[PDB]
């Protein structure tokens, strides 16, 4: 009955792990992952390719669910949404509800959810065995507000929780990374990593 999703990492019996493309901190980068911070820095409405690995083949009807929650304990109970300004700007792809922060592009079987008890949003894609050539699943997520959007995230850090789930939504595995949606991911990531050392 807790409406706050757990965030504990749990690679599960199928060996569910996340992978991230290797990027640098060039000021023009649209998406960059810091392994030190386990934190994704990206621009607004720009694609972030996240790798989903499973060591053992999961049961049929398995899915990957992505959901954002506030990282700070004091804001955890608060549903992460898009700010009102962006909600009404009419930029849906005709499938993503305008309030949803996290979208998926490049997947034919995306579904968007507004939980009927928790009011939390998520976006789901099916698991499918990787191709002859391919080794993992790559989903291209997009974040549709800045971290700093007033009436929205309000400068609050968020986590993206990706769970491996059966079709009914039972937990098979869980992984997470921090996300900052900002205008200059490259600089911001260099900045946060530098504060790490010095
Ligand atoms: Zn916004």
Backbone angles phi, psi at 195, to 5 degrees: -60, -30
User: Strands, DSSP E only, in the chain?
Assistant: 16-20, 31-34, 39-42, 47-54, 63-70, 102-105, 111-114, 121-126, 137-143, 158-165, 171-181
Q: Where are the chain's structural domains? A: 1-198
Structure tokens at 74: 């004091």
DSSP string over 23-76: ----TT-SEEEETTTTEEEE-TT-EEEEEEEESSPPPTT-EEEEEEEESSTTTT
Instruction: Report CA torsion sign: 162, 163, 166, 170.
Output: negative
CATH of 1-198, one of 2.30.38.10, 2.60.40.720, 2.40.30.10, 2.40.70.10: 2.60.40.720
Residue 86 among known ligand-binding residues: yes
Residue 145 among known ligand-binding residues: yes
Output b/e per residue, 69-88; b: 16+ Cβ within 10 A. Answer: bbbeeeeeeebbbbbeebbe
* 63 CB-near residues (< 8 Å, 6+ apart): 124, 125, 126, 127, 164, 165, 166, 167
* 54 CB-near residues (< 8 Å, 6+ apart): 14, 15, 16, 17, 127, 136, 137, 164
Of residues 155, 154, 5, the one with CA closest to residue 68: 5
- Strands 111-114 and 121-126 turn out to be antiparallel
CB 185 within 8 A of CB 44: no
Backbone angles phi, psi at 8, to 5 degrees: -60, 130
Of residues 189, 185, 194, 190, the one with CA closest to residue 29: 185
User: Longest C-alpha distance within the chain, in Å?
Assistant: 48
Residue 48 among known ligand-binding residues: no
CA of 173 to the centre of ligand 1 (A): 30
CA of 177 to the centre of ligand 1 (A): 21
Structure tokens at 76: 């955890």
CA of 182 to the centre of ligand 1 (A): 11
- Strands 63-70 and 121-126 turn out to be antiparallel
CA of 55 to the centre of ligand 1 (A): 37
């Amino acid at each position: 009955s807790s409406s706050v999703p757990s965030q504990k990492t749990y690679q599960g019996s199928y060996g569910f792990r996340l992978g991230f493309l290797h990027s640098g901190t060039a000021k023009s980068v649209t998406c960059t992952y810091s392994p030190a911070l386990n934190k994704m820095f990206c621009q607004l409405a720009k694609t972030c390719p996240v790798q989903l690995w499973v060591d053992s083949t999961p049961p049929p009807g398995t899915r990957f669910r992505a959901m954002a929650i506030y990282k700070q304990s004091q804001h955890m109970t608060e549903v992460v949404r898009r700010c009102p300004h962006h909600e009404r700007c009419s930029d849906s792809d005709g499938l993503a509800p305008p309030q949803h922060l996290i979208r998926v592009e490049g997947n034919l079987r995306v579904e968007y959810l507004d939980d009927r008890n928790t009011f939390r949003h998520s976006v789901v894609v099916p698991y499918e065995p990787p191709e002859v050539g391919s080794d993992c699943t790559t989903i291209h997520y997009k974040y549709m507000c800045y971290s700093s959007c007033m009436g929205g995230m309000n400068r609050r850090p968020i986590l993206t929780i990706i769970t491996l789930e059966d079709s009914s939504g039972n937990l098979l595995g869980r992984n997470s990374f921090e996300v900052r949606v900002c205008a200059c991911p490259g600089r911001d990531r260099r900045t946060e990593e530098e504060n790490l050392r010095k």
